[PDB]
Design a protein around this nucleic acid. Structure first.
Ligand SMILES: [Mg+2]
Ligand SMILES: [Mg+2]
Ligand SMILES: [Mg+2]
Ligand SMILES: [Mg+2]
Ligand SMILES: [Mg+2]
Ligand SMILES: [Mg+2]
Ligand SMILES: [Mg+2]
Ligand SMILES: [Mg+2]
Ligand SMILES: [Mg+2]
Ligand SMILES: [Mg+2]
Lengths: 99, 167, 194, 81, 132, 101, 138, 120
RNA sequence: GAACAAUAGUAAGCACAAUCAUAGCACAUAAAAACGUUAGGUCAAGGUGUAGCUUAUGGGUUGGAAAGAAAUGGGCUACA
């Protein structure tokens, strides 16, 4: 290790774009975060979920517009119809406890 | 001195595809390409051919009506090169009460252009020689006493330019 | 009202050409294919299934649009678009004297709406050092300046750049690195005499 | 004129399917009796099952052409068509 | 007992399709994959988006062809165009087949922002491989 | 509708994480460097502690995109193991087979 | 016998710019099944011989990515179900090749890529020197 | 000029047809923009606002108004080295990061004075 | 409901077997293993029938989830 080698390493850092002056291993962290993509901005992170609200809303609108037919909501509608025909339905909001 | 470099060739992206379509000619036994060539879906007569083609076109129009009816479900883009025709189209005016924008916004979509002109005229906002030209062109492209009313609108309010008005 | 039609096999001639029937990629529609083709595990008394109503033939990729006669026709069409390779550059050694710099770049294709692969930004520029006008002292300063990017056995210098968003910007930065190494290798400074 | 249709671009000069089957109906009306059977049956299988399906004016005329040319073998296939 | 993707042995009268008649350990041995796409390779990205697109295609075709859809779809991905291959029974008129074909084409093209092909083969009944 | 309120809260948490992702980077750059004065660093800890809670990346939970199972999830497919097995045994995933060697 | 006439209409414009030369172009195809890769290799080699390229094709060794999952829903860790993904490689070496030929060959191969495979192209090209290095010194 | 657009649309309705060939479908989709442009490059359509490598790598011209000899220069050369190394971030957002740091050190002035070193 | 020098058994099919993978056979391993038994485990992967809430058994924020008197299972490191 010589001062010539120090100048060669510093010159190589200046031409290739690294940090020329000596820097701590703790202090190379800020270089690492500014060089890498942050974790919350990665497409795997924010685009992790499909837009379930738009999926459900689109497919429900197609169900009521009669281009797609949904057997599962047909099953729920028939079961709720049978429950209301039997007489045990969903009460109004605010009538259940006091009455 | 012995370096020989040939010159490059510049082509449009599909010229090679018409070069392949030059070799691939029409098929003698096949159906038209739009219809499915499954024998249940092969049209037996010309009435059936027109029926199937207009059924597919009505499906295209119905699905595009769904897209224009609910544009918020198609706002998310997955394709990164961002095809502009695949976005839903907005048929709504952008600014409601501003005459100088709402005029041309309702012209570029008959009744809406007339309502925008009436809203501009009721607030004493003077339509220039370009907005009146666009409104007259929109009235002529769509649509006889209302024609004379539009003529009185063209000439009575402003001295609108000939090269739009007589045209 | 149900209607049933015979397929195109009965109307197919003996000497008709196949690329006119199949221009592009196809899902193996079985009505237009005259070959009786069987795929599927048979029953102990049974036979493999025929081409109608079989999903395995629908699953399989087809080479029906890539028949060899169609390959001859299509390549005779692409013959007008190709250009000739120079006769003087036939050998690797003459390529080494004439064009010393080689540049590795990559393009990737995948099935999906997204084109961009983050590994496509890379540019790998390789130079044989014997083809340059480096002196003795400038050459030693070049090795001690670049370090690990130079091979001591095969005498080649390899600079890989990644940092630029575009491959053209990476190419410009790599050729800039090469020319600034060339200009700073010849400089003799005050601390070089110690 | 069929070569003229085929030369530059095939489909962009005829506007509608209606006038396109008018074209092919009168085209076979000419080609049936002013050419011979060897090319008539060969363009029969090229035009009729592919391009458009026949109307009555082009239905009657193959019948009168085979009656003129005394061709009795050709009847069942065109009947099935 | 292993119960995944298997049909149970009844008295001997239930019809079965070839895909339902093979256990999952016959995948890439005797039966193949119902979807083919790039993202499940070794050093390739974007598998989960293709997976959820695959799922939404299966449910949308199952509800779009109610009862006249015979069996499972074939989903091919080849240079951003998506080929959807179906076996449909002869139940609905061809008017309604072409209406649903054009509707599904335009809707999925504008929804996944990619070109779509709908390829159909229309059959008299469910194809029976065993039993019956 | 998402399938579960935990899924809905994780969507909102990812939303505030993307909304505040740059400011956390900018403040943590000042935090994680020892060249900076300690009088500045304790202040930087004060504005990193005064940020909203749900904007932090450690609160982001990787759940299944089908049924929102909190664990047993493969990172490549973003799917739970039961749903992954259900789609894999039906042959709906390319290149996946039961393993035999 | 219905032969349409004058089917050919090419558009080729020759620029004055020197064409780019590539030393070598590597096409590595990865797939799941071997037969598709074999037939695709036969297609690519036949197109190469008709284009006059004189290529060499070799098979890189395969790698298999293996993982283990639980067999049951709730609690059975002794019994597991394992899954396997198989990828296979075929590599085409393209030697002494030009720019327009590179483009048309690559797009002909790319449009005829099947559904279940991927590939990487690695282009190493010929370039003499930049204009600021040739024989100046500062 | 609406009538020129109407003339173009009436001529294009005559010109367009239902598709008779698969290759015709591919050329129409490529001219419309639906299909990829072959041969594929991964940066098709993204020019990064026409920027070059010198605006991405060398950030020295935005370090002009800084204390030249203190730890501020240390911190900023580490930050600009990270921004030069980062491939995923645009040059306008790098300018926004540098201006955010400038704004931060502009609002906080007194704490640099009681730090013990005088910085401008 | 069977006697092979055969005395009421035919039997489509599912298992076993055969085939397939561990890049050449073979062996070995893996994979497979029917109908059923234990009302065996899972309403907390997910959906669900039935029975219960709807200013709460629902939806959000903050702060906390201790600990070993004791016993025991499986491991890691040793006792050289
Ligand atoms: Mg729930
Ligand atoms: Mg966590
Ligand atoms: Mg039996
Ligand atoms: Mg073997
Ligand atoms: Mg054995
Ligand atoms: Mg086992
Ligand atoms: Mg066995
Ligand atoms: Mg119990
Ligand atoms: Mg529950
Ligand atoms: Mg244990």
């Amino acid at each position: 290790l010589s001062e010539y080698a120090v100048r060669m390493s510093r010159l190589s850092a200046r031409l290739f774009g690294e940090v020329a002056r000596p820097t701590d291993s703790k202090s190379m962290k800020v270089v690492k975060l500014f060089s890498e993509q942050p974790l919350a901005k990665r497409k795997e992170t924010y685009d992790w979920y499909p837009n379930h609200n738009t999926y459900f809303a689109l497919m429900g609108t197609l169900r009521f517009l009669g281009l797609y037919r949904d057997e599962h909501q047909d099953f729920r509608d028939e079961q709720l119809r049978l429950k209301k025909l039997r007489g045990k339905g969903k009460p109004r909001k605010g009538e259940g406890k006091r009455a | 001195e012995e370096v020989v470099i040939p010159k490059k060739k510049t082509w449009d992206k599909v010229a090679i595809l018409q070069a392949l379509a030059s070799t691939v000619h029409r098929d003698s036994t096949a159906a038209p390409y739009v219809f499915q060539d499954d024998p249940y879906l092969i049209p037996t007569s010309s009435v059936e051919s027109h029926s199937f083609l207009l059924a597919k076109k009505s499906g295209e129009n119905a699905a595009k009506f769904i897209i224009n009816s609910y544009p918020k479900y198609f706002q998310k883009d997955i394709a990164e090169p961002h095809i502009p025709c695949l976005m839903p189209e907005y048929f709504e005016p952008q600014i409601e009460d501003v005459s100088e924008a709402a005029l041309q916004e309702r012209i570029k979509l008959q009744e809406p252009s007339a309502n925008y002109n009436f809203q501009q005229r009721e607030q004493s906002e003077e339509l220039e020689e370009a907005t009146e030209a666009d409104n007259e062109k929109s009235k002529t492209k769509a649509g006889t006493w209302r024609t004379k009313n539009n003529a009185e609108r063209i000439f009575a309010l402003m001295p609108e330019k000939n090269a739009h008005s007589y045209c | 009202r149900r209607k049933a039609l015979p397929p195109r096999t009965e109307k197919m001639a003996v000497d008709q050409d196949w690329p006119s029937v199949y221009p592009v990629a196809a899902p193996f529609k079985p009505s237009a294919v005259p070959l009786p083709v069987r795929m599927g595990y048979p029953v102990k008394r049974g036979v493999p299934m025929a081409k109608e109503g079989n999903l395995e033939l629908l699953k399989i990729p087809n080479f029906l649009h890539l028949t060899p006669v169609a390959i001859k026709r299509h390549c005779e069409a692409l013959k007008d678009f190709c250009t000739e390779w120079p006769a003087a550059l036939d050998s690797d050694e003459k390529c080494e004297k004439h064009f010393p710099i080689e540049i590795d770049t990559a393009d990737y294709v995948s099935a999906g709406p997204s084109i961009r692969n983050p590994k496509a930004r890379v540019v790998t520029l390789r130079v044989k050092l014997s083809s340059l006008n480096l002196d003795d002292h400038a050459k030693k300063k070049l090795i001690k300046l670049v370090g690990d990017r130079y091979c001591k056995s095969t005498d080649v210098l390899t600079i890989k750049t990644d940092r630029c968003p575009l491959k053209r910007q990476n190419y410009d930065y790599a050729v800039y690195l090469l020319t600034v190494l060339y200009h700073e290798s010849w400089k003799t400074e005050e601390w070089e005499k110690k | 004129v069929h070569g003229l249709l085929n030369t530059g671009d095939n489909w962009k000069l005829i506007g509608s399917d209606h006038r396109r089957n008018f074209y092919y109906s009168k085209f076979f009306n000419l080609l049936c009796f002013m050419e011979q059977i060897d090319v008539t049956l060969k363009w029969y299988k090229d035009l009729i099952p592919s391009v458009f399906f026949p109307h009555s004016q082009t239905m009657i005329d193959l019948l009168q052409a085979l009656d003129v040319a005394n061709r009795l073998d050709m009847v069942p296939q065109i009947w099935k068509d | 007992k292993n119960r995944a993707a298997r049909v149970r042995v009844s008295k001997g009268d239930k019809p079965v399709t070839y895909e339902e008649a093979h256990a999952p350990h016959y995948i890439a041995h005797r039966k193949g994959w119902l979807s083919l796409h790039t993202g499940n390779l070794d050093g390739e990205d974007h598998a989960a988006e293709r997976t959820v697109e695959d799922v939404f295609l299966r449910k949308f075709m199952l509800g779009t062809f109610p009862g006249c859809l015979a069996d499972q779809l074939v989903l091919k991905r080849r240079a951003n165009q998506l080929e959807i291959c179906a076996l449909v029974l002869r139940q609905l008129p061809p008017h309604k087949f072409y209406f649903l074909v054009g509707y599904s084409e335009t809707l999925l093209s504008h929804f996944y922002k990619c070109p779509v092909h709908l390829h159909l083969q229309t059959v008299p009944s469910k194809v029976v491989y065993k039993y019956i | 509708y998402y399938v579960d309120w935990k899924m809905l809260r994780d969507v909102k948490r990812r939303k505030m994480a993307y909304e505040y992702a740059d400011e956390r980077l900018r403040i943590n750059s000042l935090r994680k460097n020892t060249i900076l004065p300690k009088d500045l660093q304790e202040v930087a800890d004060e504005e990193i502690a005064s940020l909203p809670r749900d904007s932090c990346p450690v609160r982001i939970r990787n759940r299944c995109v089908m049924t929102s199972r909190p664990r047993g999830v493969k990172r490549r497919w973003r799917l739970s193991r039961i749903v992954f097995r259900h789609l894999a045994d039906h042959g709906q995933l390319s290149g996946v087979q039961r393993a035999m060697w | 016998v219905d032969v349409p006439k004058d089917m050919t209409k090419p558009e080729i414009t020759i620029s004055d710019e020197p064409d780019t030369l590539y030393k070598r172009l590597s096409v590595l195809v990865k797939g799941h099944d071997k037969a598709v890769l074999d037939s695709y290799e036969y297609f690519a080699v036949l197109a190469a011989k008709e284009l006059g390229i004189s290529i060499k094709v070799h098979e890189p060794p395969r790698k298999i990515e293996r993982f283990t999952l639980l067999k049951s829903v709730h609690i059975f860790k002794k019994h597991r179900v394992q899954y396997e993904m198989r990828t296979l490689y075929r590599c085409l070496e393209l030697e002494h090749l030009t720019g327009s030929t590179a483009d048309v060959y690559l797009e002909y191969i790319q449009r005829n890529l099947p559904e279940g495979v991927a590939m990487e192209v690695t282009k190493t090209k010929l370039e003499q020197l930049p204009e600021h290095i040739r024989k100046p010194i500062w | 000029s609406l009538w020129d657009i109407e003339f173009a649309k009436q001529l294009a309705a005559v010109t367009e047809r239902p598709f008779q060939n698969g290759f015709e479908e591919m050329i129409q989709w490529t001219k419309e923009g639906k299909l990829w442009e072959f041969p594929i490059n991964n940066e098709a359509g993204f020019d990064d606002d026409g920027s070059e490598f010198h605006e991405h790598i060398f950030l020295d011209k935005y370090l002009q108004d800084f204390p030249k000899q203190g730890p501020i220069r240390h911190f900023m050369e580490l930050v600009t080295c990270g921004l030069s190394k980062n491939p995923y971030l645009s040059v306008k957002q790098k300018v926004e990061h540098i201006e955010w740091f400038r704004n931060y050190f502009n609002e906080k002035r007194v704490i640099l004075k009681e730090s013990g070193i005088q910085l401008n």
